[PDB]
Design a protein around this ligand. Sequence first.
Ligand SMILES: C[C@H](CCC(=O)O)[C@H]1CC[C@H]2[C@@H]3[C@H](O)C[C@@H]4C[C@H](O)CC[C@]4(C)[C@H]3C[C@H](O)[C@]12C
Ligand SMILES: C[C@H](CCC(=O)O)[C@H]1CC[C@H]2[C@@H]3[C@H](O)C[C@@H]4C[C@H](O)CC[C@]4(C)[C@H]3C[C@H](O)[C@]12C
Ligand SMILES: C[C@H](CCC(=O)O)[C@H]1CC[C@H]2[C@@H]3[C@H](O)C[C@@H]4C[C@H](O)CC[C@]4(C)[C@H]3C[C@H](O)[C@]12C
Ligand SMILES: C[C@H](CCC(=O)O)[C@H]1CC[C@H]2[C@@H]3[C@H](O)C[C@@H]4C[C@H](O)CC[C@]4(C)[C@H]3C[C@H](O)[C@]12C
Lengths: 328, 328, 328, 328
Amino acid sequence: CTGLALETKDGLHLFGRNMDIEYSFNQSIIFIPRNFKCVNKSNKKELTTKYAVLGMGTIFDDYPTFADGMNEKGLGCAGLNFPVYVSYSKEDIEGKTNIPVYNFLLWVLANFSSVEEVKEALKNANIVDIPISENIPNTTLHWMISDITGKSIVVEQTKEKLNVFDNNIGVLTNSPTFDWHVANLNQYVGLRYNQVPEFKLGDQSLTALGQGTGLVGLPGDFTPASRFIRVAFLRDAMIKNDKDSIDLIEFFHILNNVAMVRGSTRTVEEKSDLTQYTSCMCLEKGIYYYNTYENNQINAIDMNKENLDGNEIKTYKYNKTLSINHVN
Amino acid sequence: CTGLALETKDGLHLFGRNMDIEYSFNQSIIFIPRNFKCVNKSNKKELTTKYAVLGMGTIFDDYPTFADGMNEKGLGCAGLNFPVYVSYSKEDIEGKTNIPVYNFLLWVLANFSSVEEVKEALKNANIVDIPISENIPNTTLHWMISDITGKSIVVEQTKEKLNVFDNNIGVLTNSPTFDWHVANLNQYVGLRYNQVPEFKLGDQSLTALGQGTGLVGLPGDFTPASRFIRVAFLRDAMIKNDKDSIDLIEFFHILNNVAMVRGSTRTVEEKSDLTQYTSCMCLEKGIYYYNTYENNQINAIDMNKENLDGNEIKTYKYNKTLSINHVN
Amino acid sequence: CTGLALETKDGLHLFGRNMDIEYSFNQSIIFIPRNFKCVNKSNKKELTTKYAVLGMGTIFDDYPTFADGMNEKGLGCAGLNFPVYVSYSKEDIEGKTNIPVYNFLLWVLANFSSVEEVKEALKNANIVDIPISENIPNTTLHWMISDITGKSIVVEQTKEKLNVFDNNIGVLTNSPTFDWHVANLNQYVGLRYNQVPEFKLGDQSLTALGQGTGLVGLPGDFTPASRFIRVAFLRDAMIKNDKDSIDLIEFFHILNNVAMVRGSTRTVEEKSDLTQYTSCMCLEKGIYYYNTYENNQINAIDMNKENLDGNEIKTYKYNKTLSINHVN
Amino acid sequence: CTGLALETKDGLHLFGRNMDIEYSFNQSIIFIPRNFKCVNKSNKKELTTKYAVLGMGTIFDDYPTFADGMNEKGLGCAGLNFPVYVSYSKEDIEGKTNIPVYNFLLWVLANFSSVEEVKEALKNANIVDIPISENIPNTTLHWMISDITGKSIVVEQTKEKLNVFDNNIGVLTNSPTFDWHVANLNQYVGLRYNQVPEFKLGDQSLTALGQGTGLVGLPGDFTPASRFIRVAFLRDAMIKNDKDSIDLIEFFHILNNVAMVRGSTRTVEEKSDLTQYTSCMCLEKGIYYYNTYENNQINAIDMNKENLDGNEIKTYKYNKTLSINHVN
Ligand SMILES: C[C@H](CCC(=O)O)[C@H]1CC[C@H]2[C@@H]3[C@H](O)C[C@@H]4C[C@H](O)CC[C@]4(C)[C@H]3C[C@H](O)[C@]12C
Ligand SMILES: C[C@H](CCC(=O)O)[C@H]1CC[C@H]2[C@@H]3[C@H](O)C[C@@H]4C[C@H](O)CC[C@]4(C)[C@H]3C[C@H](O)[C@]12C
Ligand SMILES: C[C@H](CCC(=O)O)[C@H]1CC[C@H]2[C@@H]3[C@H](O)C[C@@H]4C[C@H](O)CC[C@]4(C)[C@H]3C[C@H](O)[C@]12C
Ligand SMILES: C[C@H](CCC(=O)O)[C@H]1CC[C@H]2[C@@H]3[C@H](O)C[C@@H]4C[C@H](O)CC[C@]4(C)[C@H]3C[C@H](O)[C@]12C
């Protein structure tokens, strides 16, 4: 998984992710209107939305749970895989705001209008490993939260503390912890976006074979660490050199570089791990953009075309049918 | 530049390329019907097409010159940048079939129905540095040619000889010579597509942080050598593990991994080198598919919808307008 | 800097380091006998040795301070550069065992007989930035401590806490923190010591060009992170495959791989950072072995040849004169 | 295997190699005087030395064959492993100077006084796969030749031609061909010896963790290609920055970086491939210097202490006994 935040040339804020998994989670694009009561059946925990919500998720036991999404106030949140280093409590901790793993994303979007509000609420928060239904284990997760101010935070629950990091890199992947990846960036201070055309090796003259010699050393595999490095520097380069031309498609160009391709990232169960979808949320405008591995055309769902005071959850079918423009 | 050949699950043959340049060459999709007379003005050299042709190129002095394209018989050819190691003759060489650099691609597509025919004709061929007009220098090039048999060849003119390589890798990039890249592949025999979940480092247990640990060592930069390695192995992995599911979109997934992103591949003239377009030719069906940096939706031009016995060159506008599916 | 601990085929324990600096620190091999009173002049802080000590250090204002060393009980300690992530207190912290930076190494060796004793004493310890003389700033440091049990620990003072890590890797370099390097090891789970002779790339057969194809991906630069990875895996491979043949020279072979070479690691002040010396302590036998950049022959100083109840500090001249065996 | 040529601060010329093998070849240091008749028994081929010779080799059937060596005129030659790309003739080729593989090194040293003389003689030369005895296959080899002018050449016999390359890099390893490695150097034009202390990643400040950030991207494994890159750049850096301080020990420092360490380079037969010895020839002075994996002290054999008009081959025992300087 790879999360990305980017500001457009027009001062708007994009936030989204690659979804990298080997299976379907019966996903659909889910819209939840304001003041909507969401009730879980296995437990008795209830949630009423303050703000209208739009994102990718699934309806499990009539209850919505999200992979990534936005609200009407321009707050975005994405849940990304976080194995090994995560640690949830088994039960609710007395004196803390206890949030079940499966519900954290919705809890953020339904209740808060900004990263600042979320940061304050998370000070006394605790993420609990409570099943959504039956005995079903929760996915190991960490979250990236971003809003219209351009500020992003990273939420990671460890054994010692629920950590909330200021994210000044604009990216997130998977394990290890966020501060590890931040420290790892320091290894690549010698990278250059500008071409190195020549090198005089004493009595031998060396000449650049093609463009891109400055970035030699950039890791090209699909591990969380390597992907973090790649997107961090691709994002940096475009902000440095092309701030005034950043638009929607650029977001997809960055994430395409770290997208997994069928066949080459094989699990222990002999399945291909691939980038199933790429989402991009235009936070100010309430538009959820996404494409999929099967259909690369960007699809747009605009929450502002909905009745925000509506009385029903609305879903939209996950598009897996390649859309081609037949010119002639 | 990156060229790719791929066979689909249905036994059809895809051939295409990423176009990686920092400028526009006034490109359009160009269709040339059968028995069409193409005349160059600066010189008096003439060409009459035996087969109908469809591809990306430009009309320079009313004369068409191509970046990549196909003919009605399922033969495809792409011209890719080849600096330093290339060497064209200044004048026509007596006793040889002399082909001007700018005309080589059209010469292949207009005259021959197969790689086998092309191979035979190239035995006595010579590529000459003759200007298309005035004093204008030709681009340093090498070519990949592929047909419906699934065979591909690489054409590289050096000082000593016009080299024709059998391409069993299914890919091409830029400099150095093709045999160099073939030998370079041997360095990466230790790559694995299958996950390496653990390593016992004596008294320390090491655990995979995420998926993709087998490919650690894969180069992630945008140099011709690194891109060649990446596409060679991405292609191999998908053929090995997913032969029966290869379709059109998979071709784009492979090439997306080596596509240049705005800002990070900067020329000496402080311009961004980017993947301007990606083309994919369905050789059997005569369909030219392509998308662009600005518009990622795949566009299709089917030469079989044209009158192949037509009397005029037809062009189609290079699509740079992002095409979004507005769901609601 | 690189620290290493290794057990020999005969069950003895080697501990030592590469000293990687661009300057001389007026070093000599320093022996301090038992019950010897060491007094610092700028402050009034005094130290009386419980155990006899032998190592590399310098006499600054008649007061000894060490780079690395051992005591008569088989306890070894090395101080290695630790910039950025270190944080010493400005003054003594009330209720804690306050140790000046420059004195920490001697404090360990003079007082304690084992890693276990040191671990217990460090629970309430604090490292303070007190000048050795005048206003002179202390070097940013972290320490590796090892004994005859084969156990090693790493001591790192941060803002929050004095951290004591169990070192199961057997190595140490520089920044970042120890736990960062431990987590970084996980990236290289795909490394193999055994040759990969071939790879079948579909229609192309790939063959290993030479030995060592399994380790492709190992970083070859001289940064702390890369050096940590290299020595960790070189050590692991030899323990795995050659446990019963490990001897003194093997220790040097491992460290030679991460030794800096004149000219290629240049500081901002245009000086060559090099491996000035390599020390190896045979902990059981009280022998300090070392060579230097100028003289690669191993020199041995045996503390047991000294009077351990002696009344004077003894020093031995740092050997920088290449020692050659003239055969004929 | 790694070959290296280096000029000292005093204008003298060093030439030598790492011997990287998993076995002993019953090696000794062999001196052959002038006008000495060497006769092979299996065939009837004879060789009379014009110049006195000194190097590492073995006496096989009373006949000397060399791994590397020098003559009295300051000409040096080393044979290095060259699998796959080599191709010797089965029989003598009519009209050519036919040299058996096992005899090539001695043929160079015994007959010629300079690289220039050797270059001229090799124009009509052919290397033949004739057994030294019985049916025993020859080792796949290529050679580096160097003299007191500071010029080096590389000799590689392929199917098409006996290739003689001018070596302006000062190094050699193994497969692929020399021109491949020369072209491979171009990939690393972005390497820097000077520290990169900082990088401003937008809103995140990145700081060098330690020295050596400029060389990030240098390959750290033990394959021929990676070793070639490392020594080429280590040599370049020292000539660039430390020309006036290059001496004997520097030669060893460079080669130590690419020396194989027991346990980590394992063959298919589960044996450790290691750097068995490192030789360095002071060409002007006729001194053969070497150390071994077991004994790192440099040993010196001076051919000028011998009777060059002597009547017997003299050998010196390969030193595998660690030589330590006991200081006290
Ligand atoms: C796909 C998404 C994000 C995880 C990721 O990016 O890897 C995850 C986060 C929490 C997940 C859900 C929760 O873990 C609860 C359920 C657990 C079951 O094992 C699968 C369905 C289930 C309803 C999950 C579906 C899906 O895998 C969710 C929604
Ligand atoms: C874009 C394409 C492929 C090169 C590449 O992939 O880098 C190249 C190949 C030959 C080129 C053409 C020929 O070199 C002839 C012309 C040369 C002029 O300098 C530009 C226009 C000109 C008409 C070129 C346009 C364009 O750059 C072409 C068509
Ligand atoms: C060389 C050694 C280890 C540091 C390293 O490995 O980089 C360091 C550790 C503490 C150092 C000493 C202490 O910092 C105190 C002194 C500080 C002065 O700036 C130099 C001399 C001085 C007496 C130092 C000499 C030397 O650099 C020491 C002994
Ligand atoms: C060790 C040296 C260099 C090869 C290398 O660097 O890998 C090689 C070159 C030619 C070799 C010799 C020749 O191939 C002829 C003999 C062949 C037999 O298989 C071994 C002994 C034999 C007498 C070899 C000993 C040794 O391996 C030599 C001397």
